[PDB]
């Protein structure tokens, strides 16, 4: 990554490398893996991001889908930012340079530490997260329509299952409580929730069915 | 977080990230999780606080309740601090900027390192702790009225259960020893505690029933 000493390059740490490999091994593509990826790649160059992705051993269907998404975003970058070499001068990055495929570490450091900075690490991380979002959605095991409270299931446990599924499915903010959460509750809790009226908070609903 | 080098940004560490994820996994919403959260987020930006909250995989009912509390506090901030862009100048943070939703890391660093400093990390942490307090209270499994000493239960173990419950229930300082602790003791210890008279310290009570 790039850190303050002046902005300088520092090697990716064994702690960082191991943390990422282990979270993928333990959590696969549960939604919380994405914020962990983003945090572990703080200040990362494109090289660092590729290291992190390349160190993953399993899940090669997912990694190939990610590669496709990256290539699509690279192509769209080039369409929106075409480029027309001067001795010792900084060249303009293409999509493949942002993805670390046709750029050197030194070029990446040059862009990231320029004034004004061209944040190729942040741009590439955006594309990677777009790809991971698609994978998380595809690998979500359950539709929100199929999360229904059991006859003997505590309301708290049902709500945990409901919002876990909703997070993975990644519907729009508008689509993403006053509707399906009540409809999918069990007969006894539904009767209680209906009586609360419109505009009840989640806290109030959970208290009511506790 | 923001640290002294001059006040500079430093990436959240893998040790910090892992510690928080593990304490939530191991302790859920036992009261001691809150002081741990506060300590692990020392010097945190709003971005760092969101990273910590976003890396939690389970407990999505709790995380949605927390989101509601944050939104309420953001709205109250805006009501109390309205805002009326000058080139290259620091703008005033709204509630959503304090919560890291509409602000950039660079803006957050700008506010936190200003003279005088606008401590958006500390303000946001306050709102988060308010939310966690509510969750800890809701998820408390036992009322203090139901903590009673068993016939063969050592007084020390009963007092441990009593104050564990009292901590989670979070009654006022005034409400929160000379009353219920004695009344809920077993017949033999109660007789001894009654004879001690008014104003007996906890140490004296524990010695008496040992």
């Amino acid at each position: 990554p790039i850190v303050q000493n002046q902005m300088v390059h520092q090697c990716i740490s064994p702690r960082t490398l191991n943390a990422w490999v282990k979270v993928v091994e333990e959590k696969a593509f549960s939604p919380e893996v994405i914020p962990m990826f983003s945090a572990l790649s703080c200040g990362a160059t494109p090289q660092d991001l590729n290291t992190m992705l390349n160190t993953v051993g399993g899940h090669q269907a997912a990694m190939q889908m990610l590669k496709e998404t990256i290539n699509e975003e690279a192509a769209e970058w080039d369409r929106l930012h075409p480029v027309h070499i001067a001795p010792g001068q900084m060249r303009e990055p293409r999509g493949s340079d942002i993805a670390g495929t046709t750029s050197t570490l030194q070029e990446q450091i040059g862009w990231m530490t320029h004034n004004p900075p061209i944040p190729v690490g942040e741009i590439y991380k955006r594309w990677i997260i777009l790809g991971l979002n698609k994978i998380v959605r595809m690998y979500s095991p359950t539709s929100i329509l199929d999360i229904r409270q059991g006859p003997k299931e505590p309301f708290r446990d049902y709500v945990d299952r409901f919002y876990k599924t909703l997070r993975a499915e990644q519907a729009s903010q508008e689509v993403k409580t006053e509707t399906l959460l009540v409809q999918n509750a069990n007969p006894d809790c539904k009767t209680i929730l209906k009586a609360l009226g419109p505009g009840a908070t989640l806290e109030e609903m959970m208290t009511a069915c506790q | 977080p923001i640290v002294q080098n001059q006040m500079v940004h430093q990436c959240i560490s893998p040790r910090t990230l892992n510690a928080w994820v593990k304490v939530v996994e191991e302790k859920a919403f036992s009261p001691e999780v809150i002081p741990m959260f506060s300590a692990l987020s020392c010097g945190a930006t709003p971005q760092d606080l969101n990273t910590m909250l976003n890396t939690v995989g389970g407990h999505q009912a709790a995380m949605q309740m927390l989101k509601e509390t944050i939104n309420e506090e953001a709205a109250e901030w805006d009501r109390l601090h309205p805002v009326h862009i000058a080139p290259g100048q620091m703008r005033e943070p709204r509630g959503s900027d304090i919560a890291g939703t509409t602000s950039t890391l660079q803006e957050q660093i700008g506010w936190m390192t200003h003279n005088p400093p606008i401590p958006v990390g500390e303000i946001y942490k306050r709102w988060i702790i308010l939310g966690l307090n509510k969750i800890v209270r809701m998820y408390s499994p036992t009322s203090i009225l139901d903590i009673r000493q068993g016939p063969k239960e050592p007084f020390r173990d009963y007092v441990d259960r009593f104050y564990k419950t009292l901590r989670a229930e979070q009654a006022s300082q005034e409400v929160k020893t000379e009353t219920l602790l004695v009344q809920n003791a077993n017949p033999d210890c109660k007789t001894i505690l009654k004879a001690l008279g008014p104003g007996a310290t906890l140490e004296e009570m524990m010695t008496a029933c040992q």
Partner: peptide
Amino acid sequence: SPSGVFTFG
């Protein structure tokens, strides 16, 4: 496209 998983911020 999916909305992402960053519940906070």
